Amino acid sequence: KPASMYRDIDKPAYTRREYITGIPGSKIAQHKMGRKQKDADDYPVQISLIVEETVQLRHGSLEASRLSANRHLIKELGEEGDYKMTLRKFPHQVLRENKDGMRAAFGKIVGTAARVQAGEQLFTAYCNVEDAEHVKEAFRRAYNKITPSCRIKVERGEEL
Amino acid sequence: ATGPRYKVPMRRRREARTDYHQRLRLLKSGKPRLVARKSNKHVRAQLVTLGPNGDDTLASAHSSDLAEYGWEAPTGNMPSAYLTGLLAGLRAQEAGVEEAVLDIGLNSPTPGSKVFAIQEGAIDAGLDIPHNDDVLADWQRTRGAHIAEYDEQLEEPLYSGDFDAADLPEHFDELRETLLDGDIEL
Amino acid sequence: MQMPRRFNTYCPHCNEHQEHEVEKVRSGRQTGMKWIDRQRERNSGIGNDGKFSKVPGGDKPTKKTDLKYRCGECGKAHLREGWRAGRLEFQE
Amino acid sequence: PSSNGPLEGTRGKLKNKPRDRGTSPPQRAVEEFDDGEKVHLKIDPSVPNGRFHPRFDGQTGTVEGKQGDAYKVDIVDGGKEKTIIVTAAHLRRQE
Amino acid sequence: MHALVQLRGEVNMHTDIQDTLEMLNIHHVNHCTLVPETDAYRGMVAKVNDFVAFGEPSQETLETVLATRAEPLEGDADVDDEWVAEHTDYDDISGLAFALLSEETTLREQGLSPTLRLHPPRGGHDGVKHPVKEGGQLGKHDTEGIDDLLEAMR
RNA sequence: UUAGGCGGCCACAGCGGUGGGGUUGCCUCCCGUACCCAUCCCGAACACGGAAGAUAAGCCCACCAGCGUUCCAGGGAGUACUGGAGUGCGCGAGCCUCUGGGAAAUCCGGUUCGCCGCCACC
RNA sequence: GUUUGACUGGGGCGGUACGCGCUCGAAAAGAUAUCGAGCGCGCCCUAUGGUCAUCUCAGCCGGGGACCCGGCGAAGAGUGCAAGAGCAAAAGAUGACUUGACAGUGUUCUUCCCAACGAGGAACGCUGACGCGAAAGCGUGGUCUAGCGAACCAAUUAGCCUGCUUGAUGCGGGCAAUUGAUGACAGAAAAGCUACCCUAGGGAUAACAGAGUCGUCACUCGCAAGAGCACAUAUCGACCGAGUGGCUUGCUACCUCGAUGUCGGUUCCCUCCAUCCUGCCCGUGCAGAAGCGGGCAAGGGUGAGGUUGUUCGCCUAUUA
RNA sequence: UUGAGGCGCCCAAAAUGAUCGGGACUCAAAUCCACCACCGAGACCUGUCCGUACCACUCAUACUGGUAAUCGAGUAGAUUGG
RNA sequence: ACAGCUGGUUCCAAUCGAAACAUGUCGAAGCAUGACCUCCGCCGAGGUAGUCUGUGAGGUAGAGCGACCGAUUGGUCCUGUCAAACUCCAAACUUACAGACGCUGUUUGACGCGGGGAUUCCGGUGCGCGGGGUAAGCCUGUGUACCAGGAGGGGAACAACCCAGAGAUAGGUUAAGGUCCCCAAGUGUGGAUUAAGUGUAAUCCUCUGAAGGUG
Ligand SMILES: C=C1C[C@](OC)([C@H](O)C(=O)N[C@@H]2OCO[C@H]3[C@@H]2O[C@H](C[C@H](O)CO)C(C)(C)[C@@H]3OC)O[C@H](C)[C@@H]1C
Ligand SMILES: [Cl-]
Ligand SMILES: [Cl-]
Ligand SMILES: [Cl-]
Ligand SMILES: [Cl-]
Ligand SMILES: [Cl-]
Ligand SMILES: [Cl-]
Ligand SMILES: [Cl-]
Ligand SMILES: [K+]
Ligand SMILES: [Mg+2]
Ligand SMILES: [Mg+2]
Ligand SMILES: [Mg+2]
Ligand SMILES: [Mg+2]
Ligand SMILES: [Mg+2]
Ligand SMILES: [Mg+2]
Ligand SMILES: [Mg+2]
Ligand SMILES: [Mg+2]
Ligand SMILES: [Mg+2]
Ligand SMILES: [Mg+2]
Ligand SMILES: [Mg+2]
Ligand SMILES: [Mg+2]
Ligand SMILES: [Mg+2]
Ligand SMILES: [Mg+2]
Ligand SMILES: [Mg+2]
Ligand SMILES: [Mg+2]
Ligand SMILES: [Mg+2]
Ligand SMILES: [Mg+2]
Ligand SMILES: [Mg+2]
Ligand SMILES: [Mg+2]
Ligand SMILES: [Mg+2]
Ligand SMILES: [Mg+2]
Ligand SMILES: [Mg+2]
Ligand SMILES: [Mg+2]
Ligand code: NA
Ligand code: NA
Ligand code: NA
Ligand code: NA
Ligand code: NA
Ligand code: NA
Ligand code: NA
Ligand code: NA
Ligand code: NA
Ligand code: NA
Ligand code: NA
Ligand code: NA
Ligand code: NA
Ligand code: NA
Ligand code: NA
Ligand code: NA
Ligand code: NA
Ligand code: NA
Ligand code: NA
Ligand code: NA
Ligand code: NA
Ligand code: NA
Ligand SMILES: [Sr+2]
Ligand SMILES: [Sr+2]
Ligand SMILES: [Sr+2]
Ligand SMILES: [Sr+2]
Ligand SMILES: [Sr+2]
Ligand SMILES: [Sr+2]
Numbered sequence A: 001k002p003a004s005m006y007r008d009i010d011k012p013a014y015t016r017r018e019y020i021t022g023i024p025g026s027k028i029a030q031h032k033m034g035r036k037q038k039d040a041d042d043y044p045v046q047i048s049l050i051v052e053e054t055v056q057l058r059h060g061s062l063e064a065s066r067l068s069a070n071r072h073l074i075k076e077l078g079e080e081g082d083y084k085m086t087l088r089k090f091p092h093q094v095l096r097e098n099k100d101g102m103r104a105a106f107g108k109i110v111g112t113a114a115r116v117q118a119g120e121q122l123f124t125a126y127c128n129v130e131d132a133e134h135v136k137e138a139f140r141r142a143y144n145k146i147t148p149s150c151r152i153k154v155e156r157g158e159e160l
Numbered sequence B: 001a002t003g004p005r006y007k008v009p010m011r012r013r014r015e016a017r018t019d020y021h022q023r024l025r026l027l028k029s030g031k032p033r034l035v036a037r038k039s040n041k042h043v044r045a046q047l048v049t050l051g052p053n054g055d056d057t058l059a060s061a062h063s064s065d066l067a068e069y070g071w072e073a074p075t076g077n078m079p080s081a082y083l084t085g086l087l088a089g090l091r092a093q094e095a096g097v098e099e100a101v102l103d104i105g106l107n108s109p110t111p112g113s114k115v116f117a118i119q120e121g122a123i124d125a126g127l128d129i130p131h132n133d134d135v136l137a138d139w140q141r142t143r144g145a146h147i148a149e150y151d152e153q154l155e156e157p158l159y160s161g162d163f164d165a166a167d168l169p170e171h172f173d174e175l176r177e178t179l180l181d182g183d184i185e186l
Numbered sequence C: 001m002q003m004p005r006r007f008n009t010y011c012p013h014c015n016e017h018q019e020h021e022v023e024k025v026r027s028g029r030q031t032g033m034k035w036i037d038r039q040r041e042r043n044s045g046i047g048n049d050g051k052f053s054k055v056p057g058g059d060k061p062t063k064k065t066d067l068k069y070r071c072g073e074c075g076k077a078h079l080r081e082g083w084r085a086g087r088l089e090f091q092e
Numbered sequence D: 001p002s003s004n005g006p007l008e009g010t011r012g013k014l015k016n017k018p019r020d021r022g023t024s025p026p027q028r029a030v031e032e033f034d035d036g037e038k039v040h041l042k043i044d045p046s047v048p049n050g051r052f053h054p055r056f057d058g059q060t061g062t063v064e065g066k067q068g069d070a071y072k073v074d075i076v077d078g079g080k081e082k083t084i085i086v087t088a089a090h091l092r093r094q095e
Numbered sequence E: 001m002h003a004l005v006q007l008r009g010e011v012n013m014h015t016d017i018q019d020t021l022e023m024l025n026i027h028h029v030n031h032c033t034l035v036p037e038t039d040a041y042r043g044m045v046a047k048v049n050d051f052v053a054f055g056e057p058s059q060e061t062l063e064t065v066l067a068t069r070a071e072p073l074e075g076d077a078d079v080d081d082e083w084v085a086e087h088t089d090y091d092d093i094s095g096l097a098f099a100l101l102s103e104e105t106t107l108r109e110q111g112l113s114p115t116l117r118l119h120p121p122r123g124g125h126d127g128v129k130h131p132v133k134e135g136g137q138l139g140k141h142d143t144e145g146i147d148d149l150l151e152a153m154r
Numbered sequence F: 001u002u003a004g005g006c007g008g009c010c011a012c013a014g015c016g017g018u019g020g021g022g023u024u025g026c027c028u029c030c031c032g033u034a035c036c037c038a039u040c041c042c043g044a045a046c047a048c049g050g051a052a053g054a055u056a057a058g059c060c061c062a063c064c065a066g067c068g069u070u071c072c073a074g075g076g077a078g079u080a081c082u083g084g085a086g087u088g089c090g091c092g093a094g095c096c097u098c099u100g101g102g103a104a105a106u107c108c109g110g111u112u113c114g115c116c117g118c119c120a121c122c
Numbered sequence G: 001g002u003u004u005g006a007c008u009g010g011g012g013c014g015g016u017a018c019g020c021g022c023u024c025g026a027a028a029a030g031a032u033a034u035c036g037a038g039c040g041c042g043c044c045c046u047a048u049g050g051u052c053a054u055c056u057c058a059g060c061c062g063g064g065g066a067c068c069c070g071g072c073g074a075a076g077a078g079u080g081c082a083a084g085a086g087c088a089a090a091a092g093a094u095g096a097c098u099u100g101a102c103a104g105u106g107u108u109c110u111u112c113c114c115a116a117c118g119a120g121g122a123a124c125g126c127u128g129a130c131g132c133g134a135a136a137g138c139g140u141g142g143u144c145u146a147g148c149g150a151a152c153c154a155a156u157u158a159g160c161c162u163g164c165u166u167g168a169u170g171c172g173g174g175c176a177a178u179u180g181a182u183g184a185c186a187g188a189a190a191a192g193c194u195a196c197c198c199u200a201g202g203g204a205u206a207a208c209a210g211a212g213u214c215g216u217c218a219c220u221c222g223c224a225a226g227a228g229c230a231c232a233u234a235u236c237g238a239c240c241g242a243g244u245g246g247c248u249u250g251c252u253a254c255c256u257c258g259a260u261g262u263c264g265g266u267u268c269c270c271u272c273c274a275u276c277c278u279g280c281c282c283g284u285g286c287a288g289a290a291g292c293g294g295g296c297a298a299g300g301g302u303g304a305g306g307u308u309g310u311u312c313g314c315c316u317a318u319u320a
Numbered sequence H: 001u002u003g004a005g006g007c008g009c010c011c012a013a014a015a016u017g018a019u020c021g022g023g024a025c026u027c028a029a030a031u032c033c034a035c036c037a038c039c040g041a042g043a044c045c046u047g048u049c050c051g052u053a054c055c056a057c058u059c060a061u062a063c064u065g066g067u068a069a070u071c072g073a074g075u076a077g078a079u080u081g082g
Numbered sequence I: 001a002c003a004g005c006u007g008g009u010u011c012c013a014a015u016c017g018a019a020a021c022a023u024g025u026c027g028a029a030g031c032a033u034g035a036c037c038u039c040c041g042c043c044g045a046g047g048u049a050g051u052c053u054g055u056g057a058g059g060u061a062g063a064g065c066g067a068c069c070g071a072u073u074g075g076u077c078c079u080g081u082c083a084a085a086c087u088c089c090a091a092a093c094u095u096a097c098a099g100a101c102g103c104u105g106u107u108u109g110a111c112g113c114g115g116g117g118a119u120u121c122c123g124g125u126g127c128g129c130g131g132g133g134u135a136a137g138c139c140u141g142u143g144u145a146c147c148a149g150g151a152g153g154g155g156a157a158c159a160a161c162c163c164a165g166a167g168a169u170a171g172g173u174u175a176a177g178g179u180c181c182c183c184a185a186g187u188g189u190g191g192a193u194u195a196a197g198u199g200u201a202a203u204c205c206u207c208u209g210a211a212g213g214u215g
């Protein structure tokens, strides 16, 4: 289905699994990536990806982006390069669809999304001053698969 | 103690000195409480009224100042208890107090116990307290017959300092007697 | 809930306390000499009757316990309300 | 609502804050008021008997005599005047 | 002492606000009242902040206005020094004007109508769709600004 | 209050800890079961009677902030949110200005190791 | 001769949101809708009720998943049943006593916010009688909020009133109250077909068409994993993301029910471009020939036939 | 070399005849920041009159005088004079 | 014939002026009882639409959760996220009562009380907050102002957007909005940007334009 159906925030927060059922499983396979044993302070550079508009990101978008995003870093830095990217958000908001007529319209659970207020960090990478351009390119790809426009901001990087 | 959600009992309950659940029932009558409390060596009998910042004591009576009138004997027995009661009963009679409800505190409603024996004295003093006759001890044990007949089982004085060997429950009568006297400085 | 065959209770009579039994109304028959045995033939004839041409109605998923509290020394009884009980046992 | 019972939607108003749990002090379940006195109606979650209909929490009434040990406070619901029977345990002297 | 001036109509304005205005003895657009400065009086103007123009006028202007727009409690009688003196515990406009500002008396306490029915601002005002800060005419004003208007509404 | 009884507020009073305190005084632990009373078994408790001993508990007194809690300073923050107004902006979700209010988390620094009432008493 | 209800994103089918209780929706007083989300009640118990005495629970640790001793332990236990709430020297557990789940009559609130309305319900009094306790006191059922029902008729109960001139006997009329149910739950005893139809009306309400919407459908774009023997980008192209159209479908119920004739076809006229051919172009996995993909472009053209009412589609032979 | 902001450009396909109402406008007749002068209601101010309500006078609800910043829109409907 | 259903019901003016909602109803195209409109009589001094302050009620926004609760990462304590049916926190704000100021009432009698007569119980829109639905000129709440039942001015036309609430007549100044022409008023002033006719379109079914990109 189109993201148009669930990109804005207009329903009440809907996440009480204790009342909701048939909630589809997350398509996300890893929130921690790269060398997840090292640390964030172990790196000079810390570039995160910031969402410019508050929205909802269906897990299919997170994974779709996170994938092609990280997949780049794996390519340009090796399946064991010296980096560690992270996706801090999680798909809590449950999404329904009324699939009859308008009678008894409450839908049936079909997905999960992550509410991300504008200005927040969807992703946060940690790399060495060299691969800083491979991470920026790794985000240029990722922000093409989520709905909002974004900013690639450096949290620690005087090397420029 | 643990965190915010924690619940610490009302002070007087931690201390384990006031039985609020029972207290309430008491406080209801509207009548002053005839507080009866024991002690290893002593026995007190306060007459409390309720107040804006805490209970008020309109009339007490401690077994210690029981000697103040001529008591040369111990201060933690039936004779003692009764008397102390009748003493406070009188003082209270001197404050405008006419009726009260026995507040035996954390003690036990045991038959013939010093408390009921304390309650019996305040009644005799003229006060009006809801009681149960057959729960009070027999006039004699109130006097000290139970103890006198114990020293009969002598061989060794019932007491240390000499009040007397055979003990004088008559003294009980002597003191009680002295209380019904109008003069007596309360 | 059961029901003690003989419990100590009050009664709107002797202003005192004795023993009251427990007996489920055994009711009575149709007199035949009542105001309904006559107007049953007077409110009929040929056709319909309305209340006489009607039939009995159903019941609730339970039946309240209709009683009669007989007395010991006395010998008479009164009437209180009943409770919706599937059954009941006047223990002994 | 979904049901029209007295306690409908009264989770909030009829419940003590954690540290106010358990039995309540007797000092206020015995408080004596004088006819005419203004009092604030507020139910004590810890207290069971002597409660007025929840819908009246927050009302400031005027003691116009008492029934038994309980009081008969006068209040005005919207525009209709009503006589509420409440026990001291659920009352506070105004001002 | 502040000069309250209704600059926005009644249609569509909340009722509790309009009721406040009428409480402040102001019933029509362009009508003006001189309100003290207490907590109570503050709450009211604050609440009317959007359909009014207010501030403290210069003794000068306050006079210019009183002269041109003050009225008895009933009548056409011009409120001029003579009038003022013959009825008010004062001796002339300036005398009155000073008290109002010093907050000693009130147009009513004297026998003047609480309202000063002004005339449309000559040359127009700075608009009723924005405050004074945004370049409009609504809200609190500069003792000079307030005058600029009241002056213009002789 | 050189140690007590009854309380109100019911953690600022909790939790944890250190140090001091008692010859006929107080409170206790304590000594003991003939009686009133007592234990589904126990004088443990409850109840009764009494001082040979003790200040080790308790309790009272002084103090400690590590945990919990109350309030306060500064920082967060006039930020989040928000009552009123706008021919202000934005495709839009939404944002902004003016006016009146205004947090929470957290951090650092103070406070807090109870307060007050009546009665009795070297 | 009549009956055969109502609700309803039209009606039918389905369902019950048709009487009740709880949390959320509900926007920090009160009130608050939808075929709103989660879920219940139509009883059950004579002890599983009442009081008094004694006592403290889950779970955990250590000493000998039964038992026993000690320690930590404000409550996570238990309290009949939904949910929310109350409760620890108790409202929970044990023991014993007890049967107040008693008679009767009221006040108040609720039922029905505000604001009139019955039954039912609750809190709170008084009179009588009881139960427990030393006593204050507690018991008008189970800690609170669900477990409920009018008249008529029948039965039943205490005392009293009364039945046509009159006495006796018999049988009746009545005051007061209990039980038996109407769940469509403020109560009718009660099935269907009608294309043979009929009337009153409705665009208060469906079907064609219009209009809004665009999930669906058609088309595009972004990023470009992947393959294409090597090579993303000759060509193909997933995922995800952004959109355009108003041809499909669905949705809504705004317009029309004192009627806007309903599919397909035909005939005749105008148009759109997202282009099938034709003109001019670019790339090629462009030798040529023949293609494949793309750009500009709507001047012109885009035909005849076999099955099927078919639209669509399948099939034949011609065709630039 | 890199950060930021402004206006604009690409993305951008529909059916009888194109559109900001039209004309047409480019150091503007656009946009943004300021400023000056004007035009423009039945609103506001003002002269006179009318109705209505209230006051004085009055038998009057007939005159006369007075007050209204705080009276003057209205479907269903209630009320009343003609 | 009956109908709760469609149509129609004839002169002037003055005062006030709705309800399209609650409870029950074989009730939903109808009634009844309330709310609300109006008229009459009675009572006789207070009343409370605004604000401020004092004494109270509250768990929505926000926030947070080694504070409960249930969700929800990873690493050898540290680290990553949530909640309509969670809460150690917590507004704005709404709300009871009282005082004060304001306003109002005691010849215009308020507040209140009794009685007669209604209409009404298809609502709609804007805005704020909502719940459902991809959406809707959707369905269904709530507070509020407006349309209905509201002229006049402006917005090209246009119930509800802006100004404005309006006796007659008249002079004047303004409001919204506008000043190149059509068209009353500037081809106004200082300065900058734009080269696309971007634009000359407050709001909107109505005025689109997006992700992405732009020596
Ligand atoms: C409880 C209910 C009972 C009743 O009251 C409301 C009514 O009582 C009834 O209908 N039947 C009864 O049967 C038992 O007692 C009587 C009653 O009347 C019978 C005649 C009937 O009233 C007309 O035909 C009867 C034959 C006189 C019979 O005699 C024994 O109505 C509903 C049925 C309602 C559900
Ligand atoms: Cl004691
Ligand atoms: Cl039976
Ligand atoms: Cl009540
Ligand atoms: Cl051919
Ligand atoms: Cl006339
Ligand atoms: Cl008006
Ligand atoms: Cl042009
Ligand atoms: K038609
Ligand atoms: Mg019948
Ligand atoms: Mg709530
Ligand atoms: Mg005047
Ligand atoms: Mg002008
Ligand atoms: Mg203007
Ligand atoms: Mg020591
Ligand atoms: Mg806009
Ligand atoms: Mg129907
Ligand atoms: Mg009902
Ligand atoms: Mg509420
Ligand atoms: Mg029967
Ligand atoms: Mg019904
Ligand atoms: Mg017909
Ligand atoms: Mg329609
Ligand atoms: Mg035709
Ligand atoms: Mg083309
Ligand atoms: Mg052509
Ligand atoms: Mg053919
Ligand atoms: Mg007329
Ligand atoms: Mg007239
Ligand atoms: Mg929240
Ligand atoms: Mg109409
Ligand atoms: Mg001109
Ligand atoms: Mg254009
Ligand atoms: Na269906
Ligand atoms: Na006959
Ligand atoms: Na409490
Ligand atoms: Na046994
Ligand atoms: Na010691
Ligand atoms: Na039927
Ligand atoms: Na009733
Ligand atoms: Na579209
Ligand atoms: Na369509
Ligand atoms: Na055709
Ligand atoms: Na062509
Ligand atoms: Na064919
Ligand atoms: Na009319
Ligand atoms: Na008919
Ligand atoms: Na109806
Ligand atoms: Na009807
Ligand atoms: Na006043
Ligand atoms: Na919010
Ligand atoms: Na309606
Ligand atoms: Na209006
Ligand atoms: Na117009
Ligand atoms: Na143009
Ligand atoms: Sr929504
Ligand atoms: Sr994007
Ligand atoms: Sr007959
Ligand atoms: Sr027959
Ligand atoms: Sr049934
Ligand atoms: Sr011993």
Ligand SMILES: [Sr+2]
Residues within 6 Å of the ligand: F091, I207
């Ligand atoms: Sr728009």
Ligand SMILES: [Sr+2]
Residues within 6 Å of the ligand: F091, F092, I210
């Ligand atoms: Sr869009």
Ligand SMILES: [Sr+2]
Residues within 6 Å of the ligand: none
């Ligand atoms: Sr401030």
Ligand SMILES: [Sr+2]
Residues within 6 Å of the ligand: none
């Ligand atoms: Sr038929």
Ligand SMILES: [Sr+2]
Residues within 6 Å of the ligand: none
């Ligand atoms: Sr249908």
Ligand SMILES: [Sr+2]
Residues within 6 Å of the ligand: G143
């Ligand atoms: Sr109860």
Ligand SMILES: [Sr+2]
Residues within 6 Å of the ligand: none
């Ligand atoms: Sr059949």
Ligand SMILES: [Sr+2]
Residues within 6 Å of the ligand: G195
């Ligand atoms: Sr046929």
Ligand SMILES: [Sr+2]
Residues within 6 Å of the ligand: none
């Ligand atoms: Sr070609």
Ligand SMILES: [Sr+2]
Residues within 6 Å of the ligand: G311
């Ligand atoms: Sr077709």
Ligand SMILES: [Sr+2]
Residues within 6 Å of the ligand: none
């Ligand atoms: Sr086919």
Ligand SMILES: [Sr+2]
Residues within 6 Å of the ligand: none
């Ligand atoms: Sr084209």
Ligand SMILES: [Sr+2]
Residues within 6 Å of the ligand: H072, I167
């Ligand atoms: Sr008029």
Ligand SMILES: [Sr+2]
Residues within 6 Å of the ligand: none
């Ligand atoms: Sr009129």
Ligand SMILES: [Sr+2]
Residues within 6 Å of the ligand: none
């Ligand atoms: Sr009017």
Ligand SMILES: [Sr+2]
Residues within 6 Å of the ligand: I094
């Ligand atoms: Sr509210």
